[PDB]
Amino acid sequence: DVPTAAQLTSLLNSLADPNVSFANKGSLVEGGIGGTEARIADHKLKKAAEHGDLPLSFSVTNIQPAAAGSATADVSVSGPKLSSPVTRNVTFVNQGGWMLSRASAMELLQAAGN
């Protein structure tokens, strides 16, 4: 079993939602988001809003399996700040719906700024 493109971009959308604090995005990431982890993602999203970086847009391709019921995908992110899209390969995990792996979620977090 593999997630559909729509499932993943719907997930990345919710993650990317500035109206919602990451304390309430726990359900979207593997193992949830600690009070540390969450405070950073809140600030970086916050800063990206203030700089007009949003809304981000995600095209997902190259869905692939992984062990222990995980999946791989290439997500390309666009936005009014990004002259050309940025593509990462991140892995998702599926426990009651699909979520960003904890690895890939600390990965994207680290890579977004500062």
UniProtKB/Swiss-Prot annotation:
Lineage start: Bacteria, Bacillati, Actinomycetota, Actinomycetes, Mycobacteriales
Lineage: superkingdom: Bacteria
The record's subcellular locations are:
Secreted
A single GO cellular-component term from the record reads: extracellular region
**Would you tell me the protein name for this molecule?**
Low molecular weight antigen MTB12
Briefly state the protein's biological role.
Answer: May play a role in the development of protective immune responses.
> Can you name the source organism?
Mycobacterium tuberculosis (strain CDC 1551 / Oshkosh)
Give the chief site where it resides.
secreted
Q: Give the keywords, sorted.
A: Secreted, Signal
Q: Which family does it belong to?
A: Belongs to the MTB12 family.
